[PDB]
Amino acid sequence: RNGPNEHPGAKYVIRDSGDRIDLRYSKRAGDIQLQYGWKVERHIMDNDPVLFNRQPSLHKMSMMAHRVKVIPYSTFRLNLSVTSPYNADFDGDEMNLHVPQSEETRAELSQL
Amino acid sequence: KEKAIPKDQRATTPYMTKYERARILGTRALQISMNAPVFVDLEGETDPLRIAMKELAEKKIPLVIRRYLPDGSFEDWSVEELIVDL
Amino acid sequence: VGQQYSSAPLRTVKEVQFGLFSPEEVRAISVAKIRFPETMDETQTRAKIGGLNDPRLGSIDRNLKCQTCQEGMNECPGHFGHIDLAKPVFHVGFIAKIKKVCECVCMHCGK
Amino acid sequence: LRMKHGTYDKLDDDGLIAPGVRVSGEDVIIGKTTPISPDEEELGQRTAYHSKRDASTPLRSTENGIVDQVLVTTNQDGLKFVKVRVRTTKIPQIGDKF
Amino acid sequence: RGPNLNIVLTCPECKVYPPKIVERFSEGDVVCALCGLVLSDKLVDTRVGEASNPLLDGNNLSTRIGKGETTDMRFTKELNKAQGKNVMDKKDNEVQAAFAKITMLCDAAELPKIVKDCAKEAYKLCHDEKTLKGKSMESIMAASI
Amino acid sequence: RRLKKVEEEENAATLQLGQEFQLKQINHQGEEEELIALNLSEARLVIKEALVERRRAFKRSETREKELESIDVLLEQTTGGNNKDLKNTMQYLTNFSRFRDQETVGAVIQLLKSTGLHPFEVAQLGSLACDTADEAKTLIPSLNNKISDDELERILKELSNLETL
Amino acid sequence: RCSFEETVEILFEAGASAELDDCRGVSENVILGQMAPIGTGAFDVMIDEESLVKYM
Amino acid sequence: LRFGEMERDCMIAHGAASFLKERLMEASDAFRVHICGICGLMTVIAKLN
Amino acid sequence: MFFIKDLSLNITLHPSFFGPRMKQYLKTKLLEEVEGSCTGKFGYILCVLDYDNIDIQRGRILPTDGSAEFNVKYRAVVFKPFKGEVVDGTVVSCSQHGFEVQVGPMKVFVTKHLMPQDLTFNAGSNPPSYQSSEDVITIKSRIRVKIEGCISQVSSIHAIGSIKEDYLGAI
Ligand SMILES: [Mg+2]
Ligand SMILES: [Zn+2]
Ligand SMILES: [Zn+2]
Ligand SMILES: [Zn+2]
Are I26 and I4 found together in one domain?
A: yes
Strand residue runs (E) in E26-134:
29-32, 38-41
Are I68 and I107 found together in one domain?
A: no
- What ranges in chain I are assigned the alpha helix state H? 22-33
Residue I66: its chain A contacts at CB < 8 A? Answer: 104
Distance from CA of C10 to the nearest CA of I (A): 10
I8 Cβ contact partners less than 8 Å away, ≥ 6 residues apart? I71, I72, I73, I74
Spatial distance between the Cα atoms of F109 and F95, rounded to a whole number of angstroms: 21
Question: How many beta-carbon contacts under 8 Å exist across G and H?
Answer: 31
Please state, in angstroms and as integers, the Cα–Cα distance from residue A93 to each residue in A54, A86, E103, E113, I85, following that order: 9, 11, 53, 48, 78
Cβ within 8 Å, pair I35-F79:
yes
Residue E72's identity, in one-letter code, is: D
Are I20 and I96 found together in one domain?
A: no
Phi, psi of E6, deg, nearest 5: -125, 140
Number of Cβ atoms within 10 Å of the Cβ of B73: 12
Spatial distance between the Cα atoms of D22 and D10, rounded to a whole number of angstroms: 9
Spatial distance between the Cα atoms of F163 and F98, rounded to a whole number of angstroms: 7
Spatial distance between the Cα atoms of G1 and G17, rounded to a whole number of angstroms: 15
Please state, in angstroms and as integers, the Cα–Cα distance from residue F96 to each residue in A81, E66, E111, following that order: 86, 81, 93
Q: Which ligand is nearest to the CA of C57?
A: 2
- SS3 of residue I158 by DSSP: strand
User: Would you call D93 an interface residue with chain A, using a CB distance cutoff of 8 Å?
Assistant: yes
A75 Cβ contact partners less than 8 Å away, ≥ 6 residues apart? D94, D95
CA angle F67, F69, F75 (to 5 degrees): 100
A13 Cβ contact partners less than 8 Å away, ≥ 6 residues apart? A20, A21, A23, A32, A34, A38, A39, A40, A41
Among the listed residues I12, I6, I71, I83, the one whose alpha carbon sits nearest the alpha carbon of residue I45: I6
A8 Cβ contact partners less than 8 Å away, ≥ 6 residues apart? A2, A42, A43, A45
Are I109 and I130 found together in one domain?
A: yes
Residue A67's identity, in one-letter code, is: R
Distance from CA of H45 to the nearest CA of C (A): 6
Dihedral sign, Cα of residue I144, residue I145, residue I146, residue I151 = negative
CA angle C79, C82, C85 (to 5 degrees): 170
F29 Cβ contact partners less than 8 Å away, ≥ 6 residues apart? none
Residues pairing with G47 in the sheet: B63
Chains that touch E (3 or more CB pairs under 8 A): A, C, D
Q: Quote the number of domains for chain I.
A: 2
Pairing of strands I106-111, I156-162: parallel
Chains that touch H (3 or more CB pairs under 8 A): A, B, C, F, G, I
Torsion of CA C31, C33, C36, C40, to 10 degrees: -10
Structure-determination approach = cryo-EM
Domain residue limits at I21: 1-82
Resolution of the experimental model in angstroms, please? 3.4
Between C14, C15, C20, which is nearest G15 by CB?
C20
C104 marked among binding-site residues = no
Contact G34, C12 (CB under 8 A): yes
Question: How far apart, in Å, do the first and last CA atoms of chain B sit?
Answer: 33
Spatial distance between the Cα atoms of C19 and C21, rounded to a whole number of angstroms: 7
Please state, in angstroms and as integers, the Cα–Cα distance from residue I80 to each residue in I40, I107, I151, I156, following that order: 9, 13, 12, 12
Are I47 and I77 found together in one domain?
A: yes
Contact I2, I78 (CB under 8 A): yes
Spatial distance between the Cα atoms of H41 and E106, rounded to a whole number of angstroms: 55
**What DSSP line would sit under I47-79, residue for residue?**
EEE-TT--EEPPPEE-TTT-PEEEEEEEEEEEE
Number of Cβ atoms within 10 Å of the Cβ of I76: 22
Nearest CA in chain E to C51: E59
**Domain assignments of chain F as residue spans, ordered by start:** 1-37, 38-165
Dihedral sign, Cα of residue H24, residue H27, residue H28, residue H31 = positive
Contact G35, H13 (CB under 8 A): no
Number of Cβ atoms within 10 Å of the Cβ of C11: 9
E70 Cβ contact partners less than 8 Å away, ≥ 6 residues apart? none
Cβ within 8 Å, pair C17-G20:
yes
E131 Cβ contact partners less than 8 Å away, ≥ 6 residues apart? none
Cβ within 8 Å, pair E19-D41:
no
Please state, in angstroms and as integers, the Cα–Cα distance from residue C29 to each residue in C60, C69, E134, F143, following that order: 21, 14, 53, 40
Name the CA radius of gyration of chain C, rounded.
Answer: 20
Q: Which ligand is nearest to the CA of H46?
A: 2
Please state, in angstroms and as integers, the Cα–Cα distance from residue D93 to each residue in A69, C13, D98, I56, I161, following that order: 20, 52, 11, 65, 83
Residue G45: its chain B contacts at CB < 8 A? Answer: 23-24, 27, 63-66
**Helix F102-112 vs helix F149-161: angle between axes, to the nearest 10 degrees?**
170
The alpha carbon of residue C66 and the mean position of all alpha carbons in its chain are separated, in whole angstroms, by: 15
Q: Which ligand is nearest to the CA of A28?
A: 3
Residue G35's identity, in one-letter code, is: M
